[PDB]
Design a protein around this ligand. Structure first.
Ligand SMILES: CN1CCC(Oc2ccc(-c3[nH]nc4cccc(OCC5CCCCC5)c34)cc2)CC1
Length: 261
């Protein structure tokens, strides 16, 4: 029996669903037994740039509430010099844990999930935000629809019940600015590829250094096996174009036959 108090309201912890460096996400219940997700951030041992990323993430989450329902709802928040408490809507499961369960994915559900992802990422791009680290763990399944959890400004968190380089665009590897909204298109294309063939475009390469070479290698042809949905095979080919200027954009993806027909 452990509780959390946010802006006068008391919440009862069900379980810890996520943990990072200084952050924790809990599944909670209010006095009316309504479910919520609370993110706790310990600021006692936090630097100026780490503090600023959490401030910028809260600000953008609050602002982008009214612009799209495909962005996680932030009902309330408490921020002091010692901690951060964020009262958010609780989802059923994240897209990474849902896809790891394998099974059979319906073409109607995959198309509906892809539309939600395009809308969420489109909304953040319109307000000058480029995620740059999109992965299925950044998306949540709530009321049968996908919702974007974070905008990639603050630190990423691991589940509770090691990250990936599979969704990293070739521009980010060719660099170290070349990062633009097109970098998120590649990462979205990798998630859709995983939703279509049951694996990411470079999942066959278990080695991580040999994987990084394959993403930037033009001779390393990405396999696109034939499927009944021909419009789906085209979006995947257009999203996974190594040249960012030749790669399809979000406004072009929203007018593509795969989401319109
Ligand atoms: C492994 N397991 C976990 C619980 C459950 O799935 C989730 C339920 C709720 C949620 C969530 N709701 N609101 C949320 C608001 C912010 C963050 C959130 O999670 C972050 C982190 C949680 C673990 C996976 C990566 C993202 C949030 C998310 C996963 C079933 C599977």
């Amino acid at each position: 029996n452990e509780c959390i108090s946010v802006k006068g309201r008391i919440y009862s912890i069900l379980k810890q669903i996520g943990s990072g460096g200084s952050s924790k996400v809990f599944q909670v219940l209010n006095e009316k037994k309504q479910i919520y997700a609370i993110k706790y951030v310990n600021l006692e041992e936090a630097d100026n740039q780490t503090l600023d990323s959490y401030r910028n993430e809260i600000a953008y989450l609050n602002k982008l509430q009214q612009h799209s329902d495909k962005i996680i709802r932030l009902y309330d928040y408490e921020i002091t010099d010692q901690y951060i408490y964020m009262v958010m809507e609780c989802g059923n499961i994240d897209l990474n844990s849902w896809l790891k369960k394998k099974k059979s994915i319906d073409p109607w559900e995959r198309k509906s999930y892809w539309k939600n992802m395009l809308e969420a990422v489109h909304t953040i791009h319109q307000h000058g935000i480029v995620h740059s680290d999109l992965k299925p763990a950044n998306f949540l399944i709530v009321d049968g629809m996908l919702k974007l959890i974070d905008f990639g400004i603050a630190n990423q968190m691991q589940p509770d019940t090691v990250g990936t380089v599979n969704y990293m665009p070739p521009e980010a590897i060719k660099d170290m600015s070349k990062i633009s909204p097109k970098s998120d298109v590649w990462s979205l294309g990798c998630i859709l590829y995983y939703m279509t063939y049951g694996k990411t475009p470079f999942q066959q390469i278990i080695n991580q250094i040999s994987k990084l070479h394959a993403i930037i290698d033009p001779n390393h042809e990405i396999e696109f096996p034939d499927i009944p949905e021909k419009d789906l095979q085209d979006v995947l080919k257009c999203c996974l174009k190594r040249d960012p200027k030749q790669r399809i954009s979000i406004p072009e993806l929203l007018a593509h036959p795969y989401v319109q027909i």
